[PDB]
Symmetry: C3
Subunit: 95 residues, 3 copies
C-alpha cells in the first residue's frame, strides 16, 4: 500500500464537466464521481441533486490545488462542500 490524500468535492450535478476538467488539468491520475442528494445551510444552489467526487493524489499540493480552484470558482455561486483525508492505496496504481 501507499499513503495518499483523498479529496472529496460534493457539488451541483450541473458542474460535472467543469470540475472533471479542473481535476484532469491539474494532473490527477483520475477521479471517481457518485450521484448524490443532500441539504446544506448556505442556500446558494444555482438552480433555486448533487455529485460527489473522490480524487486520490500522492501529493498534498495537488489535492490543495484542485480544492483551491474548485472553491475559488464555484463556492460563492453553487452548492459546494469539500474535505480531505488520507487513505492507503494500492501500489499498483500511480497517484
Amino acid at each position: 500500500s501507499q499513503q495518499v490524500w483523498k479529496l472529496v468535492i460534493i457539488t451541483e450535478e450541473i458542474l460535472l464537466k467543469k470540475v472533471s476538467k479542473i481535476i484532469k488539468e491539474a494532473g490527477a491520475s483520475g477521479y471517481t464521481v457518485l450521484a448524490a442528494a443532500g441539504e446544506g445551510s448556505r442556500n446558494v444552489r444555482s438552480t433555486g441533486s448533487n455529485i460527489k467526487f473522490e480524487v486520490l493524489t500522492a501529493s498534498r499540493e495537488l489535492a490543495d490545488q484542485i480544492q483551491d480552484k474548485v472553491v475559488a470558482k464555484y463556492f460563492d455561486d453553487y452548492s459546494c462542500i469539500t474535505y480531505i483525508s488520507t487513505v492507503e492505496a494500492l501500489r499498483a496504481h500511480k497517484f
Copy 2:
C-alpha cells in the same frame, strides 16, 4: 485555513430516508449528503424480509459532517436507538479536514 471535523456515516434501508433525514436536521446538523446503495450484512434484520435481494438498491448511505463530536454521536445515538433492532442499518465515524469556510 482548515478545520478538523467529524464525519458520521449511516447506511440503512431506503425506506428510512425521510425519518433519518429529519433526525439529522432536528439535531442541528448544517446539512447531510445521501447516496443510494446496495449491500449485504450479517445481522439479517431487513424489515422487508430475508433472504433479501443482494444487488437491489434498497439502501441509502448518509454522510453528516459536524464540527462537534457531541452532535455526531447525538445523531448516531438516536438513529441506532430507534432503528438498529428493527431495520438493517450500520454506522461509523471518522475525521476529515474541511475548510473553515462551511459552518459545520
Copy 3:
C-alpha cells in the same frame, strides 16, 4: 467505540457479482455498493460520465482481513479490468461486530 478498517474497491460495474463473492467467500460480515463513474490513467476497461463503475465499501474488524480481500481482488482482476482500492480506519459502535 471501536476502531475498524474500511476497504474501498472501485471497479467496473460488470464485476459486481464476482467481487461481491470474493468479499463474501473471504469472510467479511457485509459490504456496501454504490453506482459510480470516473476516469483513470491505465485505460484497461474491458468493455466517461456514464455510471459504468461500482464503489464497494467493506468494514472489517481487522487490518488483516481488509488486506486479504484487497489482495484477492487485485490478484484476479487488476490486470484485466479497471480497478483501484484503498483502506482507511473509522470508529464503529460495539453494537455491531465486523
